[PDB]
Amino acid sequence: EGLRVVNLLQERNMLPSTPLKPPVPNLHEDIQKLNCNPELFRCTLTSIPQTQALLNKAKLPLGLLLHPFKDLVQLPVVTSSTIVRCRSCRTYINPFVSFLDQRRWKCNLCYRVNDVPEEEPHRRPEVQNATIEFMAPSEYMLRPPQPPVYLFVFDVSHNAVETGYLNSVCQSLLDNLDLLPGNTRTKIGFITFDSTIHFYGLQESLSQPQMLIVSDIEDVFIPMPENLLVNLNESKELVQDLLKTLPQMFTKTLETQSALGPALQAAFKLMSPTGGRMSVFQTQLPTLGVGALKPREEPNHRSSAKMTPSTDFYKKLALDCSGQQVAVDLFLLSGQYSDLASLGCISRYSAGSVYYYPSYHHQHNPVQVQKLQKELQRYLTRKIGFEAVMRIRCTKGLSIHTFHGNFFVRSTDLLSLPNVNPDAGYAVQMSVEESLTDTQLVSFQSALLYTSSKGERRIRVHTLCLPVVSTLNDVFLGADVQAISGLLANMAVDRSMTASLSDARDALVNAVIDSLSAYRSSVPGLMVPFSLRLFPLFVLALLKQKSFQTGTNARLDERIFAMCQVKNQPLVYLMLTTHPSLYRVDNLSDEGALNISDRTIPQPPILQLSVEKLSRDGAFLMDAGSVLMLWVGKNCTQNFLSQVLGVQNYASIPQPMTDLPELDTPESARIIAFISWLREQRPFFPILYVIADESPMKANFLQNMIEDRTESALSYYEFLLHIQQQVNK
């Protein structure tokens, strides 16, 4: 372990060769063993400052990062006829409560003594598991459990037809039609739109589905009281025929304008009585009707930091969908500026999520074609919850004051989540409202009330316990650098809209300065604690990420989507994208985890993101979470060209090489064994393309070398030099 001090100017090799593990809170052995999984619930400071003055001195943000609906390997379910909650703050009984009278327990959040109901009480599953799911009684639902409703809204303008996205989306719905979450209550519907809005009636009594057109754009309505949202079980054959027909209905269209606004109003009216998931597919700037947006000139590498929505239309509409338990997921497949800064609001405030496919085309862009294919497979098959609400409770004295993520905050900090998807991550920032002089431990509890796809009201609960410290040194010792970077990233996105991108970048740099300057005054080189040895590196990576970079050719919709990913993804994938993992893979061996029965899985050491680590004589795999990029040197060995790639020379490697061939070699075995171990750790299948070469014009591989310099950004060593000039000014 070690509470040592690091001079970053002498190390410069401080990144370990093994994956970073989240810090263990300085807790007793019996308390920590029950603590929540760090993948689900984690804090930036595992040792909570006792006072707000202490927290202000440390110059580090206090906050939580949670992934509450993540897929689990084992989930205990309590079906108790009564759910034991505190009579004052309604905190669910949890492993960190205190049984004194054995028939009375003390709440660990408000300190009130409660009566244990006639229903070894500390052996109960509610006390033995920090993560647990309850069965919500009838008082925990405002209405009968809503059925699963899936409404798909397709843009079919002339530009949308040219992309060809409709073919894969309809084909993906066909392949996954029986895998959609839900029972026999499952409902489905379809809407297409260009300059007018098109509904689709689905009745078995008819030879074919009927297309109903609403052309009154300023005054939309539902043309039929039935057969628009149909039961998938009963209309399976008709839904299939409509999916097989849609890609061919608009081949010779001439509609160039898109009435996205009115189409969403119609879709909202259709889903309003029930709620559910609304999948919008858009390919261009909306220009017709309400919600129309003006064109905007893109920036260039010469542009300074000089973000926000153009209209509040899609924000007002999302809040309408939120009140009706409707979540809007936005699929943007645009080859030109579509003002995602405004369209994205439809997903932020409805607990949806946005998906971006820049310059999608069914022939010219095979990368985005397979990317949409893989993301739709997960999107349509992953579990789902409906009409959900989440509450975050913390021990008296601590107060959540800022929320981050896709939802709507109601009164008394009630998080409205029309849908809850298992790939969403949320962030919270809190402060010490009252000095924690009384207690030495504090707890945090998130409760996720939702309706399962089977029609059962469930409550998933996580509880995290942390100790309270009273010195500056103990706050620094328990700092979670990745969690701090994740919270800072979410805070900078808000600063980007509230102020500007310039102020967001300054606040990120000043975060490292003030934090380390506070540490220096509390102890020649750049001295940092061991828990923050990677702090300037990760913050530098934020400043070179697509969200906050400056001297790049990043376009408007590009940057907005990166910020959407910061606000919506869990911590683990923010880090994988921001600071990718680099391994040399032209010489994999058997020091790995050859424990998984019949597979070796090599474990190459993690390299730092510098070209100085590369070599024109070998090949290197980069893991950026969403994609695996395999850079092969111009002077690579002949053993790697044929036994792994299947090629006889560097000059015959296919330019778009969409993946690796499973050749009959032990070379193409270890690498396919190590890749398979990486892509089995995540739900969104990361496409691997070896397209990365010395000259594919797709070697953005070098962009992820965040330690090196460029004509517009500092190098890592220069960054430390810049930091040092300030810490001891």
């Binding site: 079906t79 009838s138 209405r143 029609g455």
Partner: protein
């Protein structure tokens, strides 16, 4: 002459199945749950309750309450005919599993039959008391 149908277990007011379509509901669904709580082994097995502009009709069979709400001008004759169509089907499909369940709305998927039978009555082509008294 619109719709609101709820099926519950009389002993504990446990919800079994329901069916609601708006496009308020919060006030009358509450009253329908106050009624499910008051019903016991002394209550009338067939009754009609007056709620101002609305009217509750229910029957009790096999310890299972079948309740409907509608505007008062809806035919009282058709309300009980509709509840009879629901009882015979629900008792035939789940009547022997009702006294064993514990989750609320353990028979949600009865939603379908309620709604396909519902449209057969809201399209033209016993005891009376004030609900405020019972509550």
């Amino acid at each position: 002459m619109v719709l609101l149908t709820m099926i519950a277990r009389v002993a504990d007011g446990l919800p079994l199945a329901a069916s609601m379509q708006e496009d308020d509901l919060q006030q009358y669904q509450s009253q329908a749950k106050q009624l499910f709580r008051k019903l016991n082994e002394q209550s009338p097995t067939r009754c009609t309750l007056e709620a101002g502009a609305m009217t509750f009709h229910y029957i009790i069979e096999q310890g299972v309450c079948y309740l409907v709400l509608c505007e008062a001008a809806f035919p009282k004759k058709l309300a009980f005919a509709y509840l009879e169509d629901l009882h015979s089907e629900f008792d035939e499909q789940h009547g022997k599993k009702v006294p064993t369940v514990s989750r609320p709305y353990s028979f949600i998927e009865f939603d379908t039959f309620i709604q396909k039978t519902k449209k057969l009555y809201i399209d033209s082509r016993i005891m009376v008391a004030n609900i405020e008294e019972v509550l």
